[PDB]
């Protein structure tokens, strides 16, 4: 019974553009898209949380609250699975999917509630590692690259 | 051009792959880079080494050789679905329906004596699964047998089981012709795939820029004959790990021995021509009458039959470009002595044919009593064995200050 | 070690204290002397019981041959006039019903003096006999020795640093 | 649900029309539920514990081998009997015995610094001699015929081979609390929990 | 096979003397006994005691007219334990030896073995041997560890 | 009955060997295995030499089969060394070396026997029955 509502909800998601210029998902060709990019990221220094969280809080505006997480000194490799990477008009973009969303049923999911969810679930570190991995990938692949 | 990279260890092949990627960059950034592996740990180690060398390792696809070959079948030749109609479970469920219909034949009286004694549909599914696994092995390895069984003619010189295997396969090919399933499978497609690449003038679209074959030491001749036609158009880099630097395979004919003697490798960095055999004038005396080379090292002759067949299958390719990057190991330790004896293709085992070689014992290699490279341990139980192993690994970690448990 | 677990092994000195003890088979399960097939007689016929007891005695003789031929240097046997019958003094003993007494008394029923004369008849340089003496003087001597000093090695540093290939979920 | 629907989809892909019993689907689900393997932590950084997997040779500094006795390794998989590939072998044919021998060769070559080999030689039940595999026997034969100790420089060929094979063979004790392991010398145990048990200096 | 390579020729002659008293000693017509021959390399094997050279087979005849089962087992177990402690007490002083030609070996506790048929008489031998401060192992013990 | 020589035994038809207690039965099995591998005996020999996967040895105890396999492997290695050296220290091995005329082909056959020792057909009774039931399952009717 959920299927005829599910297909119209999927088409309503696909018709909604997600860009600062208004680019929808239907304008992306097969060569432009890449789904589930798996990356390995090396690190040779002991990852100190105190030297990293201050560097994040120096530039990221969402780190006003969010008291810092505690983790051990991690030296080695880091795995990651990016949901979607796509290019458009000579510009690369990243796309991830979050779909739990249990506590909202009304139209209260504004930018403030989404920013509070990003600060609560701590997806800022994941997005920053995704930007670092995408920057290293576009630096290794494309010659004469600017961020 | 098909490039073949012979090396003793895998780090030289990883450095050569790094030099290939840094030398020639991809024109399409979102194009995945095909690196053919066999297991997940091999792909994981390749991802970790490419991330260590480049700073990143992403958009690198590691498919199976059969999956990559079927993907190239889909991309080159049209009207082919993404999945094969002839799979193991599909042929098992087809043969479970086809075998009761074929019990009335005279050729299937053995299966009738095996099946009609007692059947709660248990022996039928086991026979269908085993015959489907054998048919999958025939689709991978023996396409000529299935091509002759599709017409209905027998092959001279096979076993008795062909007497029930030739009408069982052909009635399978009719059955997928009877249903809405497609006709095409792996056996009948490889010859058309080889011919349509040799007969074409322009390259077909959709093909990748460069394909890597790393960590793979066993392939059928059908897959290599397809990859030769694939490498005639698109540059494919084959990184093959061989323990010996000389030719240590078999031979086919004396007219093929001269063709192998005319082929010479060249170094990747030194760019100098190096021969295959240690002696070119005495190369004919090494091979036997049937075509097997008398390998001097007994361990390589006794353990490396799969690599001995694989280097013979690689040397049989016409348009193959062979490159050798062998880093020599200085024989100081016992393990380095064994690796140097395998790589240099020499026999250090003293048989003692004469009494002068049997009396003296200083003609062998000296082994230091502190050399703990190769040790053999006798234990009494599986608990005590790993209990000894834990203490020995602790001693090895204490002996070397720079030693990672990841490297163990 | 039992006789079945000593087949194919090797022992320097072998002591056989209960080689004269025998057990009578009661069930009637024998083999025919012509067809060589297993015949099970459910009725208590005396011929089937005797034909099963003959195979039981042959099995006891084979056990005796297995147990005797495992010694290398010296073997010792325990012989006694054992009577399986409930009568104490009946004038005859049941050693002829065993495996050792069938070779000692040549398959003939005799007495304890007859068993002693049959033992003393086959006396050579390799085969001798003595009486069983009940007596103990001292158990043993320990003769212990001291133990040398021994220690265990200790690892100086940590075995490994915190090296692990994780994801975003491992850091959260 | 995924395995059940996959089994029914693979059955209906061939359009099976006849009846199918319950025990066949039960045995098929029991076989498919145990088919899965895990290899996620193969090279995470801790020391790797895995079986010998063919066509996977990675260079390591220390390579240890366990269970190299006879019968256990090489893993023998008997042919079906009615297979025609076993009757007339070709070049590209693959067998599990040759794959295990090539795996042992790749384990010998892939070892960089240290090679450890341990096999069960004595039985824990009846103290019976358990012979090692043919590959390890050929390896120790080539070691004894290719190398010699500096103590006996020129004694014999077979005697020096047996002396090398006895010097390499470390016959460990049956029990961990034996004082032979804690004797100072070449090999010494790192188990400090059995050290007062081996010292025999405890109250009864 | 004519030649026997395991035992001393005294034990071989004792076996060929005991089993060739009558014809068809194994009581079946199709099972014949033949006198085996000892080895040439093992013809100097001698189990020597403190007194003199001990013979091969020593049939310890328990004296008496008629005896029971448990009393005979107890007396022969005590005689066997006395012989074991006499072989071990004189063996640790260099008196009882195993001599191959001129080579000699002292008799340890692993050389003497008691051959029984049942578990009850094995426990009887072990109880009669542990009373004289002699430890003994049972190789044929097939009891489960979960029943202790 | 007659005496048994391991180098003069006719390997035709059915033969009954009665190995007494303490005799070298395990040595005689290895001697007959080397005789069947190299094809020795002359007129009383096998009509053709056989490989390792064609010699069937049946022993009940599994540990006895493992011990016999190890002893046959050691005998194969010792006879290969004695054939490469054309000399030995054992009299039965001396007569075995005296029975063959060629040395290189026998040494190559012993090397191939040493390499094929893992695929030796030395099984138990129930193991041989299970292998024959799983191998030729059609005529037998086994799952």
UniProtKB/Swiss-Prot annotation, chain B:
Effect of mutating residue 142 to A: Acts at variant Chi sequences
Disruption phenotype: Decreased degradation of DNA with free ends that is unable to undergo homologous recombination, which can fortuitously lead to more efficient viral infection. Cells are deficient in DNA recombination repair and have increased sensitivity to UV light. The cultures have many inviable cells. Cells can be transformed with retron Ec48-containing plasmids.
Domain of life: Bacteria
Family in the record: Belongs to the RecC family.
Comment on protein domains: The holoenzyme may undergo conformational shifts upon DNA binding: the nuclease domain of RecB may swing away from the DNA exit tunnel in RecC. When Chi DNA binds to the RecC tunnel, the nuclease domain may then swing back to its original position (that seen in crystal structures), allowing it to nick the DNA 3' of the Chi site and then rotate to load RecA. At high Mg(2+) the nuclease domain may swing back more frequently, explaining differences seen in assays performed at high Mg(2+).
Subunit structure as annotated in this protein's UniProt entry: Heterotrimer of RecB, RecC and RecD. All subunits contribute to DNA-binding. Interacts with YgbT (Cas1). (Microbial infection) Lambda virus GamS protein interacts with the enzyme without displacing any of the subunits.
Note, other: In the RecBCD complex, RecB has a slow 3'-5' helicase, an exonuclease activity and loads RecA onto ssDNA, RecD has a fast 5'-3' helicase activity while RecC stimulates the ATPase and processivity of the RecB helicase and contributes to recognition of the Chi site.
Cited function: A helicase/nuclease that prepares dsDNA breaks (DSB) for recombinational DNA repair. Binds to DSBs and unwinds DNA via a rapid (>1 kb/second) and highly processive (>30 kb) ATP-dependent bidirectional helicase. Unwinds dsDNA until it encounters a Chi (crossover hotspot instigator, 5'-GCTGGTGG-3') sequence from the 3' direction. Cuts ssDNA a few nucleotides 3' to Chi site, by nicking one strand or switching the strand degraded (depending on the reaction conditions). The properties and activities of the enzyme are changed at Chi.
Protein name: RecBCD enzyme subunit RecC
Organism: Escherichia coli (strain K12)
Part of the whole protein covered: 1 to 408 of 1122
UniProtKB/Swiss-Prot annotation, chain E:
Species in which this protein is naturally found: Escherichia coli (strain K12)
Subunit structure: Heterotrimer of RecB, RecC and RecD. All subunits contribute to DNA-binding. The C-terminus interacts with RecA. Interacts with YgbT (Cas1). (Microbial infection) Lambda virus GamS protein interacts with the enzyme without displacing any of the subunits.
DNA-binding feature ranges: 69-70, 118-119
Biological role stated in the UniProt entry: A helicase/nuclease that prepares dsDNA breaks (DSB) for recombinational DNA repair. Binds to DSBs and unwinds DNA via a rapid (>1 kb/second) and highly processive (>30 kb) ATP-dependent bidirectional helicase. Unwinds dsDNA until it encounters a Chi (crossover hotspot instigator, 5'-GCTGGTGG-3') sequence from the 3' direction. Cuts ssDNA a few nucleotides 3' to Chi site, by nicking one strand or switching the strand degraded (depending on the reaction conditions). The properties and activities of the enzyme are changed at Chi.
TM helices/strands, residue ranges: none
Miscellaneous comment as given in the Swiss-Prot or TrEMBL entry: In the RecBCD complex, RecB has a slow 3'-5' helicase, an exonuclease activity and loads RecA onto ssDNA, RecD has a fast 5'-3' helicase activity while RecC stimulates the ATPase and processivity of the RecB helicase and contributes to recognition of the Chi site.
Lineage: Bacteria, Pseudomonadati, Pseudomonadota, Gammaproteobacteria, Enterobacterales
Gene assigned in the entry: recB
Domain of life: Bacteria
Protein name: RecBCD enzyme subunit RecB
Similarity comment text for this entry: Belongs to the helicase family. UvrD subfamily.
UniProt note: domains: The N-terminal DNA-binding domain (residues 1-929) is a ssDNA-dependent ATPase and has ATP-dependent 3'-5' helicase function; both are stimulated in the presence of RecC, suggesting this domain interacts with RecC. Holoenzyme reconstituted with this RecB N-terminal fragment has no nuclease activity. The C-terminal domain (residues 928-1180) has weak ssDNA endonuclease activity as an isolated fragment. RecD probably interacts with this domain. The C-terminal domain interacts with RecA, facilitating its loading onto ssDNA. Interaction is decreased by ATP.
Consequence of gene disruption: Decreased degradation of DNA with free ends that is unable to undergo homologous recombination, which can fortuitously lead to more efficient viral infection. Cells are deficient in DNA recombination repair and have increased sensitivity to UV light. The cultures have many inviable cells. Cells cannot be transformed with retron Ec48-containing plasmids.
Residue numbers binding ATP: 5
